[PDB]
Design a protein around this ligand. Structure first.
Ligand code: CHL
Ligand code: CHL
Ligand code: CHL
Ligand code: CLA
Ligand code: CLA
Ligand code: CLA
Ligand code: CLA
Ligand code: CLA
Ligand code: LUT
Ligand code: LUT
Lengths: 220, 160, 219
């Protein structure tokens, strides 16, 4: 296309020091900064599969980051969750009262983990089978951008706006995946919720940073 | 047999003593709508009858009594719900109004009475001319039975 | 059935909509599961097939070697240590590692001697497998046959292909089970047979989820 994010004049991941990007990264796909130093996308089929994997990971991680942030914020403000922290919310089902959505005893009130696992397995199996092979909500649609019933508001009719929104989606998804990797590492190292880590850093930025835990995993 | 009972419709039984559907000449100085009205009233009648019977069987509280205990405390199938009467009525009016407003926006009376489509999961309608008509007569007959049954229930509710 | 375009797939009714084009179905165990696109190049596909089959055979042997001593000990054989993941420390025992408990069998004491012997022997064997040696040269890399098929159970090509399918399927099952062995040993800390007995005792209560908060971060 003819836009700032496509073609040979697109921005690249090393600024002026990037040089010439790899030949197969011609710049016809969203979020193409020409960063394939490892050379894992030489084969176009592998490139397509990696693009699909990246997009699915991006959407899942956007959802995951939002769902990790929101309950802890609400619990900090005062909502009585069973376990507000993202990496502890799974253990609520072992509590005597069971899992309670929003802390209310009349919302969901789940008791058995086996039923949750079984229903999730069935529903998600059907969902992903429909995603791979066309189902009730469209049959002959694109694998990554089905549109149709999944774009009710008609935000992707204009091809130029469609490309712009694709770039925005991929960029926000990459940011979300980076932040989710940060979530995992901070949970492993610090042991507190991400909002707790942010509050601690804001309280004393000079000392409450990552280096404070640097001497945590040293062997003895 | 009345002349205006043209047949070719599920509810043909030769019952119209007062000539409500009888066309009349006019001077200046429709059966489809009535069939749709009977259909909708009967559908709601069977829904109400089945719900009342199930409620009487499971929890045991009288259908006429239902609402007083709900206002004091909301509960479905013996399980409590976190809804007050205000939120309940607001959700009900919004959802029912949306469903209604989508319902009447149909210029075609045949689809107005018989939308089919997503509302028919199994391909039972298809293009059959006899079996589909027979099951349509079955629906209309059960609708009439449910309407008269619920009228009897309402009559028995009073003076008791 | 098996080889052919109308073959069973890994997603059942949901698979024929999207399957890799390079997985025609001329190889055993071709269920058309290459969602990651790692076998687009045929040479890499061949190397991955070789790796898969070697892992399959090794995991079959590993599953048998993990199960047999524990079951035999349950039947009442005086083993030094029934659990597979603690069986390697028997060499450090004061009495040494004895086959089937009896001290007249093997009676190994030194770990260095057995490790060196294994290194030399397996180096020679794997070099011969990679290049070709006394047991045939220039044969099929994965199914040499000949002196490695003394019973001649795969002379008929269709029977040979069916047996290849059975081999790869049993091997995939064995590798899955060995991964389960590793994870269960890491988490539970008991032998697989002990895990099965505990699960059979109280299926609803004791299971994997019971050890769900095992690795929750501290501090
Ligand atoms: C001109 C200067 C310039 C420089 C130096 C970079 C550098 C980088 N950019 Mg780029 N950019 C630059 C200009 C621009 N970038 C971009 C847009 C982007 C995007 C969208 C992305 C990048 C990314 C990257 C990274 C790709 C290489 C990498 O993965 O590093 C890896 C190596 C390092 C970061 C160095 C190691 C860090 C540290 C010094 C060592 C760690 C020390 C630890 C204490 C030791 C570890 C502890 C152990 C024990 C566990 C890299 C950091 C990518 C990225 O962010 O990946 C991470 C990426 O997605 N850039 C734009 C807008 C068009 C630019 C404009 O000029
Ligand atoms: C039939 C029921 C059905 C349901 C309930 C869902 C629902 C879902 N699909 Mg799915 N799908 C379904 C059928 C199908 N999907 C797809 C193709 C996809 C794709 C490519 C993606 C999804 C995604 C999703 C998830 C996010 C929904 C969303 O994008 O919100 C937006 C709309 C709000 C109104 C969600 C689990 C997304 C996902 O998995 O991200 C985590 C995703 O990327 N679906 C096809 C093939 C055309 C289907 C066939 O019937
Ligand atoms: C029609 C329904 C149907 C569905 C949904 C599947 C789906 C599957 N088949 Mg298939 N099959 C189906 C029909 C058939 N299969 C086969 C033959 C085969 C074979 C031979 C194989 C498969 C395999 C698979 C799996 C591919 C792996 C995968 O996609 O990971 C996606 C799935 C998941 C990631 C599961 C997630 C489970 C759970 C929801 C998440 C767990 C949550 C944890 C608690 C998270 C905790 C985090 C921890 C780590 C900190 C997948 C489960 C392969 C397999 O078994 O690999 C494992 C395989 O080898 N199928 C046949 C015979 C023709 C079928 C007949 O209809
Ligand atoms: C699983 C996630 C995933 C996947 C499949 C891809 C896949 C792809 N990316 Mg994307 N990307 C991701 C995550 C991912 N990326 C994240 C998190 C970022 C932000 C840092 C980016 C930023 C990015 C840019 C800026 C560009 C790409 C490009 C590409 C393409 C070529 C690179 C390649 O061969 O990927 C193969 C990828 C894998 C085999 C995944 C390996 C993942 C390893 C195992 C994780 C561990 C290593 C990692 C460095 C850990 C540190 C994480 C963080 C601290 C850096 C390919 C379609 C280029 C392209 O052509 O765009 C279309 C391009 O210009 N990506
Ligand atoms: C990948 C996405 C993802 C995943 C896996 C989860 C997973 C979970 N969330 Mg999170 N969440 C997410 C995204 C996600 N969330 C996002 C995007 C939001 C923002 C809207 C939230 C907001 C949120 C809140 C506010 C809460 C959870 C809670 C939960 C837990 C139980 C949820 C439940 O009962 O499901 C089934 C849920 C439903 C079927 C929805 C019912 C809606 C009710 C009945 C009506 C609405 C309220 C009146 C579970 C760990 C709960 C928890 O225990 O956290 C500690 C909880 O209180 N989530
Ligand atoms: C239009 C028909 C209609 C109407 C107005 C109602 C209305 C009501 N029903 Mg009834 N019900 C219906 C159809 C209907 N139901 C049908 C078709 C069935 C069969 C499945 C039932 C079975 C049923 C039972 C078993 C119970 C109710 C209950 C209730 C009351 C609270 C629960 C509720 O609103 O549902 C909420 C529904 C959410 C999905 C409420 C007065 C409960 C009650 O206490 O009232 C007697 C109760 O225990 N209903
Ligand atoms: C128990 C009697 C009964 C019978 C025999 C049928 C039979 C049929 N219905 Mg009816 N229907 C019933 C109850 C029944 N339904 C109830 C209780 C409702 C309310 C939810 C409906 C609502 C309904 C709609 C809205 C439609 C049908 C349609 C159909 C046809 C498919 C088939 C003739 C469809 C039809 O006419 O096919 C085109 C159609 O559009 N029915
Ligand atoms: C190391 C073992 C190994 C290896 C090398 C292969 C290799 C291959 N398999 Mg096999 N497979 C395996 C294990 C393995 N598989 C297991 C355990 C199962 C059972 C789940 C299967 C089931 C299976 C089916 C049903 C099919 C294949 C197919 C293929 C081919 C294409 C897929 C591909 O690119 O794989 C490349 C593989 C790798 C690069 C290995 C990387 C492994 C990384 C490290 C991840 C491993 C850990 C991972 C998280 C485990 C998750 C599952 C866990 C619960 C066990 C290729 C020759 C397809 C084919 O064409 O058949 C010929 C096919 O239809 N495989
Ligand atoms: C580019 C390139 C190039 C060259 O050549 C080479 C290389 C370097 C290799 C490459 C790179 C790559 C990379 C970087 C990657 C990364 C990735 C990631 C990080 C992802 C994530 C990703 C991430 C993700 C998905 C995430 C997800 C999440 C989730 C789901 C979550 C969920 C949840 C929640 C909500 C909360 C609750 O409470 C619980 C739970 C349930 C848990
Ligand atoms: C398919 C596909 C496709 C897409 O595309 C991508 C992907 C996904 C990547 C792919 C997948 C893959 C996979 C799954 C893999 C897995 C593997 C495994 C598990 C292996 C194991 C494997 C395993 C194994 C070998 C094992 C082995 C074992 C052994 C040796 C053991 C031994 C022993 C014994 C006897 C016991 C004693 O006491 C000790 C010892 C001496 C120690």
């Amino acid at each position: 296309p003819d836009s700032f994010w496509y073609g040979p004049e697109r921005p690249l991941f090393l600024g002026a020091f990037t040089g010439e990007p790899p030949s197969y990264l011609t710049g016809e796909f969203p979020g193409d900064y020409g960063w394939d130093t490892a050379g894992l996308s030489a084969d176009p089929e592998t490139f397509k599969r990696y693009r699909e994997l990246e997009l699915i990971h991006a959407r899942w991680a956007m959802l995951g980051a939002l769902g990790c942030i929101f309950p802890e914020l609400l619990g900090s403000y005062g909502v009585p969750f069973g376990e507000a922290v993202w990496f502890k919310a799974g253990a609520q089902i072992f509590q005597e009262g069971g899992l309670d959505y929003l802390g209310n005893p009349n919302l969901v009130h789940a008791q058995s983990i086996l039923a949750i696992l079984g229903t999730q397995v069935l529903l998600m199996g059907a969902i992903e089978g429909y995603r791979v092979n066309g189902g009730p909500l469209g049959e002959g649609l694109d694998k990554l951008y089905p549109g149709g019933s999944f774009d009710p508001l008609g935000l992707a009719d204009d091809p130029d706006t469609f490309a712009e929104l694709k770039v925005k989606e991929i960029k926000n998804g990459r940011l979300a995946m980076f932040s989710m990797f940060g979530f995992f590492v901070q949970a492993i190292v610090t042991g507190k919720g991400p909002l707790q880590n942010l509050s601690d850093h804001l309280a004393n930025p000079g000392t409450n940073n990552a280096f404070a835990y640097a001497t945590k995993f040293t062997p003895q | 047999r009345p002349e205006w009972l043209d047949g070719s419709l599920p509810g043909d039984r030769g019952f119209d003593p007062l000539g409500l559907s009888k066309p009349s000449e006019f001077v200046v100085i429709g059966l489809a709508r009535f069939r749709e009205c009977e259909l909708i009233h009967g559908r709601w009648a069977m829904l109400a009858c089945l719900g009342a019977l199930v409620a009487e069987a499971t929890t045991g509280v009288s259908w006429v009594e239902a609402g007083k205990v709900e206002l004091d405390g909301a509960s479905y199938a013996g399980l409590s719900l976190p809804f007050s009467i205000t939120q309940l009525i607001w959700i009900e009016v919004i959802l029912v109004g949306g469903a209604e407003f989508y319902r009447n926006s149909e210029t075609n009376p045949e689809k107005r009475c018989y939308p089919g489509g997503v509302f028919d999961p199994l391909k039972l309608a298809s293009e059959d001319e006899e079996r589909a008509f027979r099951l349509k007569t079955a629906e209309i007959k059960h609708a009439r039975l449910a309407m008269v049954s619920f009228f009897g229930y309402g009559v028995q509710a009073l003076s008791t």
